Design a binder for these strands. Sequence first.
RNA 1: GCUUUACUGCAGGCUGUCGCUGAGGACUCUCACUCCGGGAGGAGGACACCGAUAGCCGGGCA
RNA 2: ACUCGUACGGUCACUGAAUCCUGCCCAGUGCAGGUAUCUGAACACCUCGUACAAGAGGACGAAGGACCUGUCAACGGCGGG
RNA 3: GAAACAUCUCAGUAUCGGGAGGAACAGAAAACGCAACGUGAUGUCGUUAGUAACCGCGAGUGAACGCGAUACAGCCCAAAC
Lengths: 56, 237, 92, 194
Amino acid sequence: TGAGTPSQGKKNTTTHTKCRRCGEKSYHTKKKVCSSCGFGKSAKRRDYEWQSKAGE
Amino acid sequence: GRRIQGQRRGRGTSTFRAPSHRYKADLEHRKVEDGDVIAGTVVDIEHDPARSAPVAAVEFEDGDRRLILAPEGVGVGDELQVGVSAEIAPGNTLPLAEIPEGVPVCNVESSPGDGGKFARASGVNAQLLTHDRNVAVVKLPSGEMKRLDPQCRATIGVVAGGGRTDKPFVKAGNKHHKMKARGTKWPNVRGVAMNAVDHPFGGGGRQHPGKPKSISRNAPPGRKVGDIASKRTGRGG
Amino acid sequence: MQMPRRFNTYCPHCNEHQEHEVEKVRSGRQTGMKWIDRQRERNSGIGNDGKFSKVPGGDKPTKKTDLKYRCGECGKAHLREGWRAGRLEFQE
Amino acid sequence: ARSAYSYIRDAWKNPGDGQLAELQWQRQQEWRNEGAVERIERPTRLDKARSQGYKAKQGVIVARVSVRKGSARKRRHKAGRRSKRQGVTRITRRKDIQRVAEERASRTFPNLRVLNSYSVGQDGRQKWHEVILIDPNHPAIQNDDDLSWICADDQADRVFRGLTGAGRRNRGLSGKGKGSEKTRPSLRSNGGKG
RNA sequence: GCUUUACUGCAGGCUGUCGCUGAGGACUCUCACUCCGGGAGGAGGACACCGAUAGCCGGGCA
RNA sequence: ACUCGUACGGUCACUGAAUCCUGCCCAGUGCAGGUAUCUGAACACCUCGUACAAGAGGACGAAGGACCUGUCAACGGCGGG
RNA sequence: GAAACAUCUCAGUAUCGGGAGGAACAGAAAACGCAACGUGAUGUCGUUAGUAACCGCGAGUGAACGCGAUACAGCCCAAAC
Ligand SMILES: [Cl-]
Ligand SMILES: [Cl-]
Ligand SMILES: [Cl-]
Ligand SMILES: [Cl-]
Ligand SMILES: [K+]
Ligand SMILES: [Mg+2]
Ligand SMILES: [Mg+2]
Ligand SMILES: [Mg+2]
Ligand SMILES: [Mg+2]
Ligand SMILES: [Mg+2]
Ligand SMILES: [Mg+2]
Ligand SMILES: [Mg+2]
Ligand SMILES: [Mg+2]
Ligand SMILES: [Mg+2]
Ligand SMILES: [Mg+2]
Ligand SMILES: [Mg+2]
Ligand SMILES: [Mg+2]
Ligand SMILES: [Mg+2]
Ligand SMILES: [Mg+2]
Ligand SMILES: [Mg+2]
Ligand SMILES: [Mg+2]
Ligand code: NA
Ligand code: NA
Ligand code: NA
Ligand code: NA
Ligand code: NA
Ligand code: NA
Ligand code: NA
Ligand code: NA
Ligand SMILES: [Sr+2]
Ligand SMILES: [Sr+2]
Ligand SMILES: [Sr+2]
Ligand SMILES: [Sr+2]
Ligand SMILES: [Sr+2]
Ligand SMILES: [Sr+2]
Ligand SMILES: [Sr+2]
Ligand SMILES: [Sr+2]
Ligand SMILES: [Sr+2]
Ligand SMILES: [Sr+2]
Ligand SMILES: [Sr+2]
Ligand SMILES: [Sr+2]
Ligand SMILES: [Sr+2]
Ligand SMILES: [Sr+2]
């Protein structure tokens, strides 16, 4: 069985959904954590300094 | 290289853990204040998934229903006693001090009242030898002379399910089923059959270990494989 | 080669010829208090120590002459340029 | 004449001698069974406490904190590192145990602000420090001339910013002259070379 | 990437020493500390653990 | 974690059903045990040095090594004359 | 980067953990040490200076006192009684 096209057919699981906190389709319903804002993991909003260039 | 299989083991993941949820009871001795006035009738004889040997379901005088490490000969309706003034019969648990010499015991304790550590596998027995006010020397199934406290409790008789080792598994399918009820990864791929990155014995054009199999005690985890701190190897000599 | 223990030669101190005695320079003991010894203890930390992580090199097939020319009268010594000699023995 | 306080002080000059030797051997046994941060009603070293800024007033809290002895609890490198940066065992933290204690205390009391701290001994594996914390919202402090400065907005989270005495001493700010080139006005303003 | 008796180092193990740590070169003890016991209490005991340091081993890893 | 586990256990390795069998070698390497003697760091201690310190030397000597022994279903070996 | 590379360098940089304010931090000498019959809390700007100092003494790294300016401001406990 190929890892390409025939393996795509199994893909009917819902993971990332609309987030209650930020509104992005990044809330992992199995993990109960937002990959964008970090709702579920932290009280503080997910933000990192690498999201922009070092001198910006 | 990559961590060897023995290093993945310690992480305690699903693949390596024992199916605890499917286990019946943590076979420990009962707690008596003193006096011995604790006894009970055996209700049933069940199978312990953890040890492949039978276990007796006993009901006590004080309403307590518990499973106990059953020695050979124990049946339904039998009355077992636990304590200091207990009868010297098979299935009864009393300290080594009260048990006479030359009598096969099982489910022996290390420290008094711990619940039982030694001689618990299918058909084995510890042999009580010497008596004192200080030391009761017990001969464990490995052939070792364990100097113990006389206050350490032990059940009389040999453990049930004797001679389990006698019949071969014959086919891999039978080993599979047994292994599925323990905390072990099976099947075993030889290190010599792996790649260099995966095991100290991996690599080469042909299958053979790279260095001598006997490894030092001081060796680090990831290198400590093969024959660990062997005093000798082989059959002859 | 063989070399006389005592012979006449120039003393740069006395400004005149005198009977000099020759001795092989015996190595003096180290104090461990020099600057280099202090830098060794200082600059050495976790991992490689750079220059202090090196080991002394090899040898040349034949060593040069390492002598001391002691004057007979004033008692002061001087140094001369040495020459390659496999073995240096003294005469009397 | 000598104060009664001067006797508590003279006793602590040598915590392994006299009656205090016997007292520590006894107290530490109960302390080892106590928590990480334990509020105590009265300071063990009254002289030091009062000298540091303590007063028997409403809103002046004291607490004992136990922190582990030794170097950094460091993990080894999981990626490539040059020899110098391959250490684990000999690496130590840049904040002293006292400062670790003050922070653990301040976190346990989110409303209070750290005034100062002092050592109350150590055994084989841990060190104990008593931290004096103040309630910047109690009118008993807002009106106290010798303590009302800690009520100002810019004194909020003073321990996490290293504004404690133990903080300033650990930052290399003791000496006013030679040696304090890379420390004053701040370590961060000096490129982190102190 | 991999290997080793390549170079240099880093974990890890073993070992001495210091602190915890106490009473009377082999030895007793109980009070710290440890383990067992629901507990009363039992075992062990200034050792072990832990912190620090020193020597050995150390492609397990960089 | 193994472990609701306890040597008829479970960990670490090699070989790979059955049948007939599985020789010789412990010098090297590995592992392990022992050890008069030798070698063996630091702390404490002793001499020198310094009104102190750096430092030099000594005594004691752990594991380890030397040396001795065991071990090849341990790495491996089984020739020329 | 050092024309390899280990100390060194990149650099206390990138990135990470915690936190304040409208500014932060520092701050009224156990200072300095143009050694004086001298200066006088603290930041900052110009200079001192690529100087002193560091460094497989290689490549490289690199202050301070002072001076000229800006602005200036000095106080509270602990204890004694
Ligand atoms: Cl099995
Ligand atoms: Cl010569
Ligand atoms: Cl605070
Ligand atoms: Cl001046
Ligand atoms: K580098
Ligand atoms: Mg059990
Ligand atoms: Mg078998
Ligand atoms: Mg399984
Ligand atoms: Mg296999
Ligand atoms: Mg393969
Ligand atoms: Mg490998
Ligand atoms: Mg093969
Ligand atoms: Mg093979
Ligand atoms: Mg600033
Ligand atoms: Mg416990
Ligand atoms: Mg490598
Ligand atoms: Mg095969
Ligand atoms: Mg380069
Ligand atoms: Mg060069
Ligand atoms: Mg620099
Ligand atoms: Mg200066
Ligand atoms: Na230095
Ligand atoms: Na707080
Ligand atoms: Na510094
Ligand atoms: Na051999
Ligand atoms: Na062969
Ligand atoms: Na280059
Ligand atoms: Na290169
Ligand atoms: Na350098
Ligand atoms: Sr198909
Ligand atoms: Sr699916
Ligand atoms: Sr979480
Ligand atoms: Sr951020
Ligand atoms: Sr228990
Ligand atoms: Sr148990
Ligand atoms: Sr191999
Ligand atoms: Sr044989
Ligand atoms: Sr240094
Ligand atoms: Sr080093
Ligand atoms: Sr040569
Ligand atoms: Sr806050
Ligand atoms: Sr051998
Ligand atoms: Sr002024």
